Symmetry: C4
Subunit: 31 residues, 4 copies
């Protein structure tokens, strides 16, 4: 339950990693 809990949070922690990658493109796209 708990290891399943900390697993979803490693998940959440990566998508979040992806969104900054993307505000990283946007910035390009916008000068």
């Amino acid at each position: 339950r708990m290891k399943q809990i900390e697993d979803k949070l490693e998940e959440i922690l990566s998508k979040l990693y992806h969104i900054e990658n993307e505000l990283a493109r946007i910035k390009k796209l916008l000068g």
Copy 2:
């Protein structure tokens, strides 16, 4: 006390899925 925990998680999940495509959209909007 605890189903709540994994219930808010699927929900934090769902959001980031929303955000996912919003950025997709934003990327598109921009190029």
Copy 3:
């Protein structure tokens, strides 16, 4: 120590709320 966890998932939850808005605003501001 388990109400702690939840009250954080909520403060995460909420920031995911505002995030949705920044991007729907960014979204309109170009389209």
Copy 4:
């Protein structure tokens, strides 16, 4: 698990702060 969960949540906290911060900017540029 206890320390470990609350080693990640506050890494997601921190991260929401900066993705949020990053969007403030996207605003100000965009108008």
